[PDB]
Design a protein around this ligand. Structure first.
Ligand code: CA
Ligand code: CA
Length: 801
């Protein structure tokens, strides 16, 4: 039934104009939809001029760009226009003195603290938006100072503050804004990004903003002009939270801890201000997760279900604070569940907005998310939310598909559920389901015990291991099985959320039959890799294995490839599948391939005082400077492992020719003499483009030698081994249709499957010592050998010597 059209809009700020829903996100991306399911982008990103939102970007927002976000520090080469919020401001006095305009409040940033918020206006939601002013600034300093790769002076005199002191809106500079060395005190005070403009009960206008550092602040705003009404005077709220003459009132975060993407919604139905913030880091390993507080006042205090304050008491883990409404999750499609793929899950879902419909009461969490097994690729998602009995909106487990609350029969609730509990913790981990059933005697049994009730038409009360969770039952589109299913979502007074999705009713026999038809080990006629043999199917179905011949393949799928030139070798794996007294059997016919010798395709020895390929079928290399795409470094040839090695001083390396590798069956060998270790720094690299690359990393994100692929998907070829300096080490890795191996000094240190295919039918870029981001390799690398095919353990224990 339901159709979806996806868009990649990061940090979506939703707004309804007329009958159309609009989202505005970072990087000047935006889109629109009439149904919250099918999105159509209308922007052109950082294209300038004729930028959709801003026109000639550079001149329109120059005011803001004088301070950060244009070709400066972390924005070198481009722009950084982040996390906007957009609304129709009926009171805005236009420069022709007419009333009413669409405002866009945006952020610009150059480092993790040097940022500012400014706004622009339009007669029309799609723009053009013309700059008005820049109103809040962070990362400024007590004296003249510059950042690495920045010519912008960060002294506070270079912000709006002098003008504000001249206008009588501030008395002066606050000493507390500075550390003793004159640096920006981001322990106490904010990074000026991520604005959210909202209205209170009375129609007064507020802006909340912030991201990590000192946290989230809120300022009242002049409806007529778009400017803050700065407090003018330092102080403390009645309950003790920091007030600042300029930055406003602190409502969440603190002490460097995470927390950005604030969104605040006044709900007239409950008379609460609901505060959403996202903890953690946005990246696939970041554990981005959405949090929820409330207050009776726009300016707080904001607290969670447990009555705990959103404002941190000190430099502590923020895990306990805030209802955790969504983290990493997957409703795993185990063997025997209907559909294909791994099932529906999200990684790092967050930076949300919220649409609450004045008339109907329907409510929607809007956010961007990443996904398991796709790295940094992201899309916009929308989940409905539903007010529970205790005045907390609860998030639905599935993306919105037209559903609404109904009168729900006890009959349609009773049965087996997959259940996910989001807890409080957050990390790279992905929560997966357990199995329980909600029995007609209102008990709960299975992987957890307890009780449940439906109340009124559809309120849910689930009590598990002595924890009670209040929420709703609602029907939901499960895209894995492709049915509307009954579901539940419910929050406890700890502020922990559990989710439920009803499984199709099934006998033990039908399950085993399902597990049996669905059990597949892929193409097992060309096996070069260990086979993963599942020991479990859906709903705790158990699967055991035997092998006809352990010398070919073990019971756990461990393969033994025969000698080069030998015959492929055959065996049979038998799966026995049990649940209750139902049982079935299925056999699979394996053929394990012999090793095949990789053949040398190119050789950079550096032995003839140049970057020539000795095999004489690729061009010579060229020199780079400190990145794969820049020029002007120096290659000293100096005494090395065989002949002369290539030296790299620390500030360049070698651009190898395009297309060097052009397959998914290849191998790379080289000898490395490092002086210093720097994290992420490559030797051999790597890339189709800056999102699809391979890198042989002497010290990677885990502190060890690895083979690394990124950023969509991520691959962690971890050897768990650290490499020495002033010293030669032999490194080799092979790739063979997803099959990957890495060798440290001849010994195999990593072996895996599903290695990405980065170079087949592309003309990619390759280099030694340098990439697009990290410190160049410092030391020597000798004897770079590229191959077609996968080096044999034998070929490799010979290159090592
Ligand atoms: Ca936002
Ligand atoms: Ca050499």
């Amino acid at each position: 039934d339901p159709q979806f059209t996806n868009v990649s809009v990061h940090d979506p700020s939703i707004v309804k104009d007329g009958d159309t829903y609009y989202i505005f996100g970072s990087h000047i991306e935006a889109a629109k939809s009439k149904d919250l399911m099918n999105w159509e982008k209308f922007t052109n990103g950082y294209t300038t001029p004729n930028n959709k939102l801003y026109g000639d970007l550079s001149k329109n927002l120059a005011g803001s760009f004088k301070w950060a976000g244009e070709n400066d520090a972390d924005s070198k080469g481009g722009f950084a226009v982040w996390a906007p919020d957009v609304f129709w401001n009926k009171d805005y006095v236009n420069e022709d003195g007419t009333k009413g305009a669409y405002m866009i409040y945006y952020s610009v940033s150059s480092t993790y603290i040097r940022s500012a918020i400014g706004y622009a206006v339009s007669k029309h939601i799609e723009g053009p938006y013309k700059y008005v002013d820049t109103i809040v600034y962070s990362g400024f300093t007590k004296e003249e100072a510059y950042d690495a790769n920045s010519k912008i002076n960060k002294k506070w005199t270079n912000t709006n503050i002098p003008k504000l002191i001249e206008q009588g809106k501030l008395k002066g500079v606050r000493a507390d804004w500075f550390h003793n060395d004159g640096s920006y005190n981001n322990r106490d005070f904010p990074n000026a990004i991520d604005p959210n403009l909202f209205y209170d009960e009375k129609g007064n206008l507020w802006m909340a903003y912030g991201s990590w550092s000192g946290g989230i602040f809120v300022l009242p705003m002049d409806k007529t002009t778009g400017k803050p009404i700065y407090p003018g005077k330092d102080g403390k709220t009645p309950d003790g939270r920091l007030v600042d003459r300029y930055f406003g009132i602190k409502i969440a975060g603190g002490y460097y801890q995470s927390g950005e993407g604030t969104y605040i919604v006044y709900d007239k139905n409950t008379d609460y201000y609901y505060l959403y913030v996202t903890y953690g880091w946005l990246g696939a390993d970041g554990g981005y997760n959405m949090r929820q507080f409330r207050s009776t006042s726009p300016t707080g205090p904001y607290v969670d279900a447990k009555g705990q304050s959103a404002v941190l008491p000190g430099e502590v883990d923020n895990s306990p604070y805030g209802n955790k409404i969504m983290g990493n999750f997957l409703f795993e499609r185990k063997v025997g569940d209907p559909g294909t793929g791994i099932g529906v899950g999200y990684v790092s879902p967050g930076h949300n907005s919220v649409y609450l419909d004045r008339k109907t009461g329907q409510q929607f969490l809007v956010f961007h998310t990443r996904f398991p097994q796709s790295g940094e690729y992201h899309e916009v998602r929308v989940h409905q939310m539903f007010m529970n009995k205790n005045g907390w909106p609860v998030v639905a487990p599935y993306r919105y598909a037209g559903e609404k609350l109904e009168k729900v029969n006890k009959q349609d609730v009773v049965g087996e559920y997959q259940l996910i509990n989001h807890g409080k913790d957050y990390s790279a981990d992905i929560k997966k389901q357990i199995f329980v059933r909600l029995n007609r005697n209102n008990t709960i049994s299975g992987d957890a015990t307890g009780t449940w009730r439906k109340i009124g038409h559809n309120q849910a009360e689930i009590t598990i291991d002595g924890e009670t969770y209040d929420g709703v039952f609602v029907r939901q589109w499960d895209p894995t099985s492709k049915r509307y299913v009954m579901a539940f979502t419910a929050l406890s007074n700890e502020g922990v959320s559990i989710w439920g999705s009803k499984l199709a009713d099934k006998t033990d026999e039908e399950i085993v039959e399902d597990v049996a038809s669905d059990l597949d080990l892929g193409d097992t006629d060309h096996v070069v890799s260990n086979l993963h043999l599942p020991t479990e199917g859906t709903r705790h179905t158990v699967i055991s294995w035997t092998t006809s011949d352990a010398k070919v393949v073990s019971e756990t799928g461990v393969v033994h490839r025969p000698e080069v030139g030998s015959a492929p070798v055959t065996a049979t794996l038998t799966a026995t599948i049990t649940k209750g007294d139902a049982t079935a059997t299925k056999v699979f016919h394996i053929t394990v391939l012999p090793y095949e010798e990789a053949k040398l395709t190119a050789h950079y020895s550096f032995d003839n005082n140049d970057l020539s390929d000795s095999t004489g079928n690729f061009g010579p290399g060229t020199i780079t400077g400190n990145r794969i795409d820049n020029e002007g470094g120096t290659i000293a040839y100096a005494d090395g492992k065989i002949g002369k090695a290539a030296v790299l001083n620390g500030q360049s390396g070698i651009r190898l020719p395009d297309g060097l590798v052009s397959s998914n069956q290849y191998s790379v060998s080289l000898w490395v003499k490092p002086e210093q270790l720097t994290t992420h720094t490559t030797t051999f690299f790597g890339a189709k483009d800056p999102n699809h690359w391979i890198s042989l990393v002497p010290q990677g994100w885990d502190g060890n030698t690895m083979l690394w692929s990124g950023s969509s998907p991520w691959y962690d070829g971890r050897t768990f081994w650290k490499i020495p300096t002033g010293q030669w080490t032999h490194l080799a890795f092979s790739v063979d249709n997803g099959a990957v191996k890495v060798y440290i000094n001849g010994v195999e240190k990593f072996s895996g499957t599903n290695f990405p295919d980065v170079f087949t039918g592309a003309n990619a870029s390759f280099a030694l010592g340098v990439n697009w981001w990290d410190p160049p390799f410092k030391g020597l690398i000798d004897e770079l050998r590229i191959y077609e095919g996968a080096l044999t353990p034998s070929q490799v224990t010979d290159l090592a010597q």
